[PDB]
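Reply to thread "Modeling small-molecule complexes from scratch"

Following up on the discussion above, here's a worked example others can learn from. I took a protein sequence and the SMILES for adenosine-5'-triphosphate and predicted the complex. Inputs first:
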Amino acid sequence: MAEDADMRNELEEMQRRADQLADESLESTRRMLQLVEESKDAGIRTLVM
Amino acid sequence: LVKDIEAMRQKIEVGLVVGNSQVAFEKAENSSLNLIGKAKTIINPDWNFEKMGIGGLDKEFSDIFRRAFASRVFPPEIVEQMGCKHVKGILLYGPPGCGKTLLARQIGKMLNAREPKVVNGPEILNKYVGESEANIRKLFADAEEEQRRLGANSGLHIIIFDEIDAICKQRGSMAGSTGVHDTVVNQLLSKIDGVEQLNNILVIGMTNRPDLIDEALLRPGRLEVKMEIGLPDEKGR
Amino acid sequence: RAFASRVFPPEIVEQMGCKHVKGILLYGPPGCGKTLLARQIGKMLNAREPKVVNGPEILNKYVGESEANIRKLFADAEEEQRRLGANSGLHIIIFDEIDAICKQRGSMAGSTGVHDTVVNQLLSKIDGVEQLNNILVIGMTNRPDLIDEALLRPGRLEVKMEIGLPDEKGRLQILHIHTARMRGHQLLSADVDIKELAVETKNFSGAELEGLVRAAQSTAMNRHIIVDMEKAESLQVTRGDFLASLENDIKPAFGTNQEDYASYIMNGIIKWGDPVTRVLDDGELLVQQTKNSDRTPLVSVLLEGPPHSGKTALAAKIAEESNFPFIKICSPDKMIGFSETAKCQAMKKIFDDAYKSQLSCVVVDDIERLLDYVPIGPRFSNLVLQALLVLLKKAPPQGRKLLIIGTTSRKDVLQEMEMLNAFSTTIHVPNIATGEQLLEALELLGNFKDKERTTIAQQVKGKKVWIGIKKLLMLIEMSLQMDPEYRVRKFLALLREEGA
Amino acid sequence: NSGLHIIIFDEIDAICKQRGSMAGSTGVHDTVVNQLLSKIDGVEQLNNILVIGMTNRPDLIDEALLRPGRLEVKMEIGLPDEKGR
Amino acid sequence: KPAFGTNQEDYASYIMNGIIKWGDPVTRVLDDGELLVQQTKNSDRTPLVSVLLEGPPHSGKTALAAKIAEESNFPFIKICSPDKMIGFSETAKCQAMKKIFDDAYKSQLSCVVVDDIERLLDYVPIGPRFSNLVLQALLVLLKKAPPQGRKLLIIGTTSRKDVLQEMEMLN
Ligand SMILES: Nc1ncnc2c1ncn2[C@@H]1O[C@H](COP(=O)(O)OP(=O)(O)OP(=O)(O)O)[C@@H](O)[C@H]1O
Ligand SMILES: Nc1ncnc2c1ncn2[C@@H]1O[C@H](COP(=O)(O)OP(=O)(O)OP(=O)(O)O)[C@@H](O)[C@H]1O
Ligand SMILES: Nc1ncnc2c1ncn2[C@@H]1O[C@H](COP(=O)(O)OP(=O)(O)OP(=O)(O)O)[C@@H](O)[C@H]1O
Ligand SMILES: Nc1ncnc2c1ncn2[C@@H]1O[C@H](COP(=O)(O)OP(=O)(O)OP(=O)(O)O)[C@@H](O)[C@H]1O
């Protein structure tokens, strides 16, 4: 023998959707963080008045 | 905080700033104040070594010290008058058990203010191409920018290689015709004398088989000093 | 060559059709000054900001990011090509240690990966189908010869320029350019002579030259520098004066080492008579053969004598006295245990790199040892002989002049190997024949005073001597070690038996 | 005051044999032993472990590793006399 | 604890019985050895010396060569002996001796023993055979000087010197 082979190889990235399209769902989850609180804001002060 | 007052010259206790009163500023201790100009008037990286853990090498320690730590410890102004760039790149070649990694340990961690990044042999090498090599520039990438955006003056960065002969050998004779260890070394060389001409590092290697090591790396400026350490004489002993 | 096209006024080449050069390549031995050059180019010469790539910096694990990082380099310079066809700001690229990224495509040994063939993307990008003009690219390599030549042919890269070692006086410019500032603020004495250095630096190049300088400033400060404090004094008055000589001696290796004649020369040369003069004169008449004549670019000499005559030492003397640019000693010391192939290979490297110079001299010491030779029965290695005997009759290219010596204590073996027929000439070393000649020699040495000289001298002249030096030294020495009276009697009695 | 971690190499000789450009080309994959002797005697004190090693063919092992402090003590156990037996 | 340098124990192997004095021969000989180490220690312009000990067979040669070193009290002694080299092809054999000399060339001075040379270099009379390589390496090393300032002696033994005149190592 007298054999030394030490080797390397390269990676295959699984198609993780591979587009920005993920953002739109992320935009919906923005808005549900965003547009919800003022309901309570005006709710508690509607209840004050 | 007033430090010294001089008259127009006697040094006085209370005086009167007038139009033609020149004033100098100096950043305090443990200060992060970057003052520039020369309306100023200090950093010395070595505060204490009395003696550290060593005997017999009072010649060799003297040589290494004067060569690669004197440019550091000097008036900066005169050295830029001198126009010389600091030597970097210590090498140590000898037989085993002669106290080399001890020596390397003490200077980096006991002599001067930094934490050195140390590779224990290779930690570098990896199954994937390019990221092992990239770890090299992951080493240098905390000190390079630092010089870029502080210029000449900087806190010293250090790299200690150890048993470097394993990772580096003469090209063309490496594990067959092309070689596995060839591209790591072509990066290392590319950075140390690299096109950026960073001045703020010393590379400390150590070996027991220095002939293997490539002259290409050993010529001055990449590693300038190849220093033998050997079996001590009795008085050192 | 490559910047005329930049500098000229545009109309002139507009009448021509030449597509302006893509790139260059420059190479040579290390520490020789090439990366300096490649900084200043692009620092000074162009109005642009360069992008540097370090050699492997391209490589990444995911299969397409390697190439997809190369096209990143050239997208700017191609979009401006598209936008502005005729001219552009000359986006330039700097590779470093390019040999890894580009080597011959048909070698996967040790790689076992296809990503060596990124190169196809590279040169298919550079000229490609899409010509890219108004870009410059420069390569840098220690190893010129491993590159796929598909990108060395002209128009992808025109120039193979090899930066060699500095010339002695050019070395002076390399030196003076550094010392300009050091002198300008008058931290340099007028006593040091840069020429005195530069002649005393045979092969120092570039960084190797600058190393002593950097060291010199260190050694010069350190005196005025000086425990716990390790104070740096305030004293600013200093200069390195004739300490560059001292460190030139001790600290660096040349990087091409000949410096040591010491192992060859313990005692120099005792000038012990007429023969030594005849020899050395024959020698400085022989060295001139090369230098004067262009029809004998190769010349070949033997040194014939008995053993223990120091022939191989004065060979080195005459070499340094020839004062050629490149000299070397092929020793069996440096080559030990080498099987005949490697024992040839070392020699191979010697003559091939020696030919590089416009001249050199080389000595071959103790060929009887180099090519292993023992009677009990003839036995030796032939391959070295064959190679060597060819090398003698290999004429270097285009009058790059050579001188060779070989040494033996025995010619009677050689006339059967037909080596000296191939050698041009041979010169004899007679060894010391008589008491007067000898006594003169050792009184040049000393270590017998006049009483001892005479005490010897009575009975020497009546006798006939056949001796050589290398035995005599050990004799006088070991005899010397004895007690004072005994010294000379023992010397004598040893000579009775040795030369008989 | 930390506690020991002992590590146990059953066969040393196969892993590490002399790295001196011997036994063919550079030993067998000698990068390993370089890493190791940098690790145990490295720039860190690492006062808290002992590694045990065992061979039936000791001479191969590199003296670089065997010196005092990386491994000081190489002992031989030999076929016992009647009492041990 | 043994060491990289000399041992107290390498000797008791080779001299088991010590050296008993049977006469003036023993005196003259080892006194010459003492003379030689003082030559090397004291002198300059003989960085090396070279001696061999001829004897007939079964006349202790190696013992003397050891006791000389043991009396010289030079700091670095590694004997190079065949017993530690067995079966070796000539290549690895010469590597071993050179390894010895290169370690020795580190120290400021040293004493090296070759013993049973005629067995170190393969030798047989019949259709006479030997290793050429080990020969050549050996005797250039005998002719070799270490880096300056350093000093050594090379002691050798054999039971026959006639063939060595024939093989032109004796000079
Ligand atoms: N002045 C000294 N000279 C030599 N050795 C020393 C000295 N002072 C301490 N030592 C001891 O030497 C030991 C080994 O030296 P060091 O730690 O440098 O590793 P080393 O054995 O030199 O490494 P290598 O075997 O790769 O050379 C240290 O662990 C220390 O205990
Ligand atoms: N020709 C030169 N002129 C001025 N300084 C030089 C010269 N050559 C070398 N130097 C010194 O060395 C440095 C340049 O290093 P150099 O160019 O030799 O690396 P290199 O030749 O690229 O090495 P390698 O070819 O092995 O990568 C300069 O900064 C200077 O300190
Ligand atoms: N004129 C001279 N010619 C030759 N050698 C001289 C002369 N003067 C002095 N020597 C001395 O000769 C010594 C070198 O002898 P050396 O061992 O080289 O002889 P040698 O011919 O190489 O021996 P061998 O033939 O065994 O190789 C040097 O120390 C040198 O000083
Ligand atoms: N004063 C002495 N001189 C010589 N030999 C002695 C003396 N005293 C004892 N001896 C014995 O001589 C023996 C020498 O053996 P040695 O190592 O010389 O074998 P050898 O003679 O080299 O073998 P060979 O005869 O094959 O060369 C030692 O075992 C030692 O006990």
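What I'd highlight from this example: The first helix of chain C runs from residue 4 to 7. The radius of gyration of chain C is 31 Å. Questions welcome below.
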